[PDB]
Amino acid sequence: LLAYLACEKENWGPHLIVVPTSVLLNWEMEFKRFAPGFKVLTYYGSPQQ
């Protein structure tokens, strides 16, 4: 769905994926193996980083 929105429409602005903690890595890998044309951010890991 997001890939279709990014291809058919010129809008691929910052979207949010709210997920449980356990799948936090899996999602960023889910379209790493799959469509990699997006820039993914992972938010976790102490205040510093």
Place this chain on the structure above:
DNA sequence: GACTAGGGAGTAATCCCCTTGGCGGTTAAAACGCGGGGGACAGCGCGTACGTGCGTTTAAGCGGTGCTAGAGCTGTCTACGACCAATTGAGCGGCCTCGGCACCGGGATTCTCCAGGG
């Protein structure tokens, strides 16, 4: 005068929202440990600034005096302050905003360390 009709209280069933405990998940603050280095402190030397003895004087205590202007108490009155309430407005009790505060980001600016040569 005998019995009739209707509605809010008495009795009761419904709802249902409100919390008592325990337990798991997850982030943040607290807890612990090492390399190394800068702060604490000894050993010491000294000089010069006081610690101390003695001469030679001004000065507080001494001893007394003659009063002098400010301080305590005696009437005495009278201007004023603590005694009811009508008031009626100065101001507080409860609610509704939008704005300054909360707080984080991009950047310019600034504060600090080093391994070398200069």
